[PDB]
Amino acid sequence: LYCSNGGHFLRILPDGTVDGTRDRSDQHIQLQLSAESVGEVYIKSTETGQYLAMDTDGLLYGSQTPNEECLFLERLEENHYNTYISKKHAEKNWFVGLKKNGSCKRGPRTHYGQKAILFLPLPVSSD
Template identity: 45%
Template sequence: GIMEIRSVSVGVVAIKSVNTGFYLAMNKKGKLYGTKEYNHNCKFKERIEENGYNTYASLKWKHKGRQMFVSLNGKGTPRRGHKTRRKHLSAHFLPMLTS
């Protein structure tokens, strides 16, 4: 689906589905979910990596001091945040402009 990335503050974004209007959120266990209401779980730190791709880490939650990233497995289903790392290619996304 098409996701809209909105800047919330410097380096912080909210990710929203264009089709459903749900915001992407991550709970304290690292599980990704959708919510109609924008809240603190919907804020992600956006970082542009050296390879030109972007990574998104939960602004609020960490697991044992490590950041938890938005990541998809090979089948396209979300991975738990505590199993993700910045270096994993499954956590790298390439934002594209749509018209």
């Protein structure tokens, strides 16, 4: 998936890791959001099932259950660049983010300024 960064998916590998994808494994590609409410998005996988979650260590995981940890605030940038605060890490402003090679797992680095956080899961050609 397109980001203003090295475009990959927020893939929960079956081998317990939230990594991006130079070599898209086609299935374990965790990235599909189910909005609970207003600007609150649970990042589900429809093939691995697992939910893009965030921990206090400063890294993304594919949690089986949806928590605040998995609930991501639609910050958006307006222009289809869907930035998302992990609800629990509101006090750290930790957004979802794409690691520039073949990875995803962050927290502290990923704020409003890293191209990493600017996702496109919207009606646009560059999606």
